[PDB]
């Protein structure tokens, strides 16, 4: 029925990030309290000496996976990718990778570099009005998966009726606050430059890119080939490639572009293990054609 | 004369040589002048000589299978269990590789012969402030077999 | 080619467009004007067809 | 052994025309050499 994947396919985005911007706070008086962390000139973004902790205000944009493709130049692979949809929506309703993003808040690896050296990081997640309880991320490893904790349970939850089609939109702000101490650094995300360590500045102010805080939530690949001799959650690549070290987890048999070309074309039941990786590929998104 | 396993973890985020840049290698130093006699230092996998990471797991041998308690590493290094975690367990160790300090000459204005000799070291480069005046940069490394660490932990 | 580029990155120059934190709506405003059907013929080659037309 | 930083540079190109000679090469450092292969680039 199907021979090849079209010209044209392209997908969206199912979890938009919004900016990160910074702030500086002071832990005892935190909820009322907010000062702006200007970039200071290479370029360095070191804390006042009153504050202690650093503020971190970001938010998810959560939509459909089906509602999720843009382009798809033959509508048997429109059907054929509609109908696999559907077989996930009734096996598991994308609660595992729901479970495991809200896990990617959970640890804090939205923070890079400023996890470490500190005693205490809270993170609060909010959805609509209902202020979901506070988050000690310094109890979640960056290895580990926790299943059974509640708060995530509800947020994956939500998470996975909007990724499946029980609801449009998730909107789950999120702020965090990290303690630092004072004179300390601060590391925000660096800027490409194209022609000195240019920092992101937005808003008259320091934070982290999108792009970055998105490749933290999707560390939630434990799918590999090869997930005894290396046990690391992997972001959640085609050609699956930890930049951390220099090995391709999935360099052949267990890519994306030949694992969606045996779930369509020559129609074969895959495992759970690798259903999820397809389906965390059609979360992240990306121009997914081929030529001719 | 036996080893404890400290792996730094794959993956966290932060490099694995910042890691020990900054949170494993001021205890160590901190922690050898009360050992007197260092106890040891084996980077496995310390790779090839085109390139080369020290490594992801760092083994600190010692010359006694009791002082490797008297400076206990574990709960030392309790503020990095989500980055390093480290195995309680001692097996006798020779079988590993000595390290030593190959300086690297200085800067031009320190004072062209400078770069015929600096591309050999600058190509394991652990970074280091000083506990002293505070001028800061990385020691170097190489595998050596000498067997039976000074300093900080280097022959 | 897959052997010596999958652990090559890709810097790529972009634009985007987003909101301030302040702010919570995109607001659009365009205009349409409507013009007559049998006035909107510019060039026509041949008055008959012109007058089937209309 | 050619001195390391340093590679033979053919003052005038050897694609804009030059001389495989003697006289057509100074023993520049690879920062400026990269300088000069960049400046010669944008003509």
Same mark, same amino acid.
């Given at each position: 029925?199907?021979?090849?994947?079209?010209?044209?396919?392209?997908?969206?985005?199912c979890?938009?990030?919004?900016?990160?911007?910074?702030?500086?706070?002071?832990?005892?008086?935190?909820?009322?309290?907010?000062?702006?962390?200007?970039?200071?000139?290479?370029?360095?973004?070191?804390?006042?000496?009153?504050?202690?902790?650093?503020?971190?205000?970001?938010?998810?944009?959560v939509?459909p996976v089906?509602?999720?493709?843009?382009?798809?130049?033959?509508?048997?692979?429109?059907?054929?990718?509609?109908?696999?949809?559907?077989?996930?929506?009734?096996?598991?309703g994308f609660?595992?990778l729901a479970?495991?993003?809200?896990?990617?808040?959970?640890?804090?690896?939205?923070?890079?570099?400023?996890?470490?050296?500190?005693?205490?990081?809270?993170?609060?997640?909010?959805?609509?009005?209902?202020?979901?309880?506070?988050?000690?991320?310094?109890?979640?490893?960056?290895?580990?998966?926790?299943?059974?904790?509640?708060?995530?349970?509800?947020?994956?939850?939500?998470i996975a009726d909007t990724f499946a089609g029980?609801?449009?939109?998730?909107?789950?702000?999120?702020?965090?606050?990290?303690?630092?101490?004072?004179?300390?650094?601060?590391?925000?995300?660096?800027?490409?430059?194209?022609?000195?360590?240019?920092?992101?500045?937005?808003?008259?102010?320091?934070?982290?890119?999108?792009?970055?805080?998105?490749?933290?939530?999707?560390?939630?690949?434990?799918?590999?080939?090869?997930?005894?001799?290396?046990?690391?959650?992997?972001?959640?690549?085609?050609?699956?490639?930890?930049?951390?070290?220099?090995?391709?987890?999935?360099?052949?048999?267990?890519?994306?572009?030949?694992?969606?070309?045996?779930?369509?074309?020559?129609?074969?039941?895959?495992?759970?293990?690798?259903?999820?990786?397809?389906?965390?590929?059609?979360i992240?998104?990306?121009?997914?054609?081929?030529?001719? | 004369?036996?080893?404890?396993?400290?792996?730094?973890?794959?993956?966290?985020?932060?490099?694995?040589?910042?890691?020990? !840049?900054?949170?494993?290698?001021?205890? =160590?130093?901190?922690?050898?002048?009360?050992?007197?006699? /260092?106890?040891? &230092? $084996? #980077?496995?996998?310390?790779?090839?000589?085109?390139?080369?990471?020290?490594?992801?797991?760092?083994?600190?041998?010692?010359?006694?299978?009791?002082?490797?308690? !008297?400076?206990?590493?574990?709960?030392? =290094?309790?503020?990095?269990?989500?980055?390093?975690?480290? /195995?309680?367990? &001692? $097996? #006798?160790?020779?079988?590993?590789?000595?390290?030593?300090?190959?300086?690297?000459?200085?800067?031009?204005?320190?004072?062209?012969?400078?770069?015929?000799?600096?591309?050999?070291?600058?190509?394991?480069?652990?970074?280091?402030?000083?506990?002293?005046?505070?001028?800061?940069?990385? &020691?170097?490394?190489?595998?050596?077999?000498?067997?039976?660490?000074?300093?900080?932990?280097?022959? | 080619?897959?052997?010596?580029?999958?652990?090559?990155?890709?810097?790529?120059?972009?634009?985007?467009?987003?909101?301030?934190?302040?702010?919570?709506?995109?607001?659009?405003?365009?205009?349409?004007?409507?013009?007559?059907?049998?006035?909107?013929?510019?060039?026509?080659?041949?008055?008959?067809?012109?007058?089937?037309?209309? | 052994?050619?001195?390391?930083?340093?590679?033979?540079?053919?003052?005038?190109?050897?694609?804009?025309?030059?001389?495989?000679?003697?006289?057509?090469?100074?023993?520049?450092?690879?920062?400026?050499?990269?300088?000069?292969?960049?400046?010669?680039?944008?003509?």
């Open positions: 029925t199907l021979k090849s994947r079209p010209e044209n396919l392209s997908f969206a985005r979890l938009n990030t919004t900016e990160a911007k910074f702030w500086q706070t002071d832990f005892l008086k935190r909820h009322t309290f907010k000062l702006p962390l200007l970039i200071t000139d290479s370029q360095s973004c070191t804390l006042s000496t009153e504050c202690d902790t650093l503020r971190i205000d970001f938010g998810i944009k939509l089906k509602e999720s493709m843009y382009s798809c130049s033959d509508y048997n692979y429109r059907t054929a990718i509609y109908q696999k949809i559907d077989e996930y929506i009734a096996e598991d609660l595992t479970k495991r993003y809200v896990n990617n808040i959970a640890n804090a690896r939205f923070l890079w570099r400023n996890r470490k050296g500190a005693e205490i990081i809270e993170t609060i997640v909010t959805i609509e009005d209902k202020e979901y309880p506070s988050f000690n991320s310094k109890s979640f490893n960056l290895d580990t998966f926790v299943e059974d904790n509640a708060t995530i349970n509800e947020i994956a939850q939500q029980k609801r449009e939109y998730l909107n789950i702000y999120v702020t965090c606050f990290v303690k630092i101490g004072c004179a300390m650094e601060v590391y925000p995300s660096q800027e490409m430059t194209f022609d000195g360590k240019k920092l992101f500045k937005f808003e008259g102010s320091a934070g982290m890119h999108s792009q970055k805080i998105n490749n933290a939530l999707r560390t939630i690949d434990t799918w590999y080939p090869d997930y005894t001799t290396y046990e690391f959650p992997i972001p959640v690549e085609n050609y699956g490639a930890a930049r951390s070290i220099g090995i391709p987890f999935r360099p052949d048999t267990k890519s994306f572009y030949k694992l969606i070309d045996r779930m369509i074309l020559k129609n074969e039941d895959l495992p759970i293990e690798d259903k999820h990786y397809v389906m965390a590929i059609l992240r998104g990306g121009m997914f054609s081929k030529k001719q | 004369m036996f080893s404890q396993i400290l792996i730094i973890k794959p993956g966290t985020g932060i490099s694995p040589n910042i890691i020990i !840049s900054e949170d494993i290698f001021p205890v =160590l130093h901190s922690l050898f002048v009360e050992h007197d006699k /260092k106890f040891g &230092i $084996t #980077f496995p996998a310390y790779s090839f000589d085109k390139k080369g990471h020290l490594g992801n797991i760092i083994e600190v041998l010692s010359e006694d299978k009791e002082a490797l308690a !008297s400076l206990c590493l574990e709960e030392h =290094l309790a503020e990095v269990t989500d980055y390093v975690k480290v /195995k309680k367990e &001692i $097996t #006798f160790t020779d079988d590993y590789v000595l390290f030593k300090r190959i300086r690297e000459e200085n800067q031009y204005e320190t004072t062209m012969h400078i770069k015929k000799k600096n591309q050999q070291i600058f190509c394991a480069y652990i970074k280091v402030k000083s506990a002293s005046t505070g001028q800061s940069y990385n &020691i170097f490394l190489a595998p050596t077999d000498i067997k039976h660490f000074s300093a900080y932990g280097l022959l | 080619k897959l052997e010596k580029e999958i652990m090559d990155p890709n810097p790529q120059k972009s634009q985007s467009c987003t909101l301030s934190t302040e702010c919570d709506t995109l607001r659009i405003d365009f205009g349409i004007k409507v013009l007559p059907v049998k006035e909107s013929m510019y060039s026509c080659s041949d008055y008959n067809y012109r007058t089937a037309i209309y | 052994n050619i001195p390391v930083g340093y590679e033979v540079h053919h003052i005038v190109p050897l694609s804009q025309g030059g001389a495989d000679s003697i006289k057509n090469m100074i023993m520049l450092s690879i920062e400026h050499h990269e300088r000069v292969t960049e400046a010669h680039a944008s003509y």
